[PDB]
């Protein structure tokens, strides 16, 4: 009986009633630590441009080469006629970078979770998910017949308790964000991986925010804890953030690759990526090798920034990564703080309930290697000012 | 135990004949290309308009790449929306003749995004039984009641609309062009039936976009239902438009719902300058060169006519998707091997994927195919069909 326009109207009203309705801003200059929003130069702490690569001329030149050479599109899925020399070149470079036996590029970090989780899990397997796991993962799991258990965030005690209570002639898969998207804390892999080996279980790390951030040259969270050649650790990560393009990889055992080619639904049914994207990611792996400095500078800036927000008496939720949250509780106050920051030429988006828990709305700030001190001090200056008016310092 | 699970699963897949070993292309996506170090005529791509390697799209991508960089550094709804995303969605809607348009990460995730944003516990979906896998995943993530109607059977569809109602939303869901047989959804009859029972029509036009309607405005536009607010279309930009991503096109308010509720719009980085450049390019190009769409159909007709001359069954295909019936799957895969031996590259498809006595080779004719190329493929189809004794 219900019409379109009508259903859409009902649903936007509900979202406005619950305080959750969002109005995305449009950026009017390239993705850089300083950019234009609403016709004003702002300091940009909303991006995931961790290494300053989103507009770096090296990556742009590599993309230009490959675009000219090969074209604007693979005309098909990898498994029919969409695999070209350049996809292999990238997967070869990725594995070598990662120090994994293999690597496979899929169409996003988002679909990577669906693809790998779907390929790996059957009716009978048991999954142990961290409760704060990214939405991308929840969707992946929901498309499998596996028994889904949740453990309290980063709680290795509760995790162990659950591993004793659930066993299988099949597969036990512990699943965690490597770096938690909105909280900015690191999965305790030092303790999780050992625990995993004690109970014949496999560890799956979604390292969207660890890739290009954590470990020697940003080889990632797994590589940082030194578990990268363990055949019972699987890692999937986006190439959209620090590597500043699009797509996600799945890295580990040579035989894993060959399973995903055969069983991963987004690899089977969705076009492979064009030359320009693959060019740019080849470029990015080349660049981080030439310039490991950038990763140091990312952390100097992170430390400086977190220290000052602490000095001013902001709670940073014991963040350990360049992700530097500031909690506002209800979403309306989060969006307001965002508006006031922007008035001071500082861009940091308020985040609300679909994306982050109810009663736990925040502003995520994301310090990058490309941020200069001048920029970081302007943001703090503004955070001081905006914090005074709301009387939270 | 990971090695173990991987090993057991590849074994099962090899046992069941399902294991695949993708062939690697060594030259650009064109109607003639190199696979395994041989020049072939390429009828396996979705490069419908010859855009995958067209210098116009490459030059537009180059412009936008130079101007803007290698990446949006975020999801659209935080810090990933730039001028160029707006430019594209504005050009898309105007091209489509819809009130609005929104670009998502794929046609694949577009289904999940829009189906998820639109459906609540209580709604009823009527799916065509041959609907693309992409859709099944979308629906499986909603709390909607899922009903299936016999392929393109408007009679069974009507019967189901009498048998199931809701104070909520009735959504009929169909591929616009069906990927395997290349038949067109009967929208001429479906949309009227939909208006008779206060239901909304959802068309996945991955293979209609850039193919069907004036300048490939698509299946919806072809049947003249493009300004109806109760017809929703999602389609890939990866095939005829020869890049990546999918759009959702329709009512102004649909866009604003998807920005808010579509899970792949909220949780996946927006697409980089070069991709958006190329797609802007493609919409510009098809306007300048409506010829290409004509040429796609001339070649489709030419090719289907000759396969008929030789006495091949083309399954009443209506689209540049040209099946060629080989009956049993074994013979379909064999014919696929032998075509490639003659420098002709096409996909054999059999039982799990298509019914048991209806295995075929899918060919995809494009505007970029010349007659020389089409006659080489026919030459080969003649030869391989004689030796296998399925044609005079
Ligand atoms: C090709 C196709 C898809 C997937 O489009 P991608 O851009 O490859 O994700 C989805 N649905 C249908 C009907 C298709 O033909
Ligand atoms: C950003 C992110 C994703 C999605 O990455 P895309 O490739 O942009 O879809 C998935 N998981 C986590 C933890 C993320 O941070």
Author numbering:
A (entry chain D): 3 to 395
B (entry chain A): 5 to 396
Anything the authors wrote about it?
The ThAOS catalyzes the Claisen-like condensation between various amino acids and acyl-CoA substrates to generate a range of α-aminoketones. Like other members of the AOS family, ThAOS forms a tight homodimer with the PLP cofactor bound at the interface between the two monomers, typical of type IV PLP-binding enzymes. We next characterized ThAOS thermostability, finding it stable at temperatures of up to 80 °C over 3 h.
We predict that Arg366 is involved in similar functions in ThAOS, allowing the biocatalyst to accept the observed broad range of AAs. The acceptance of acyl-CoA substrates ranging from C2–C8 is more difficult to understand since there is a lack of high-resolution structures of bacterial AOS:acyl-CoA complexes. However, the observation that ThAOS can use various acyl-CoAs suggests that the binding site is suitably dynamic to accommodate a broad range of acyl chains.
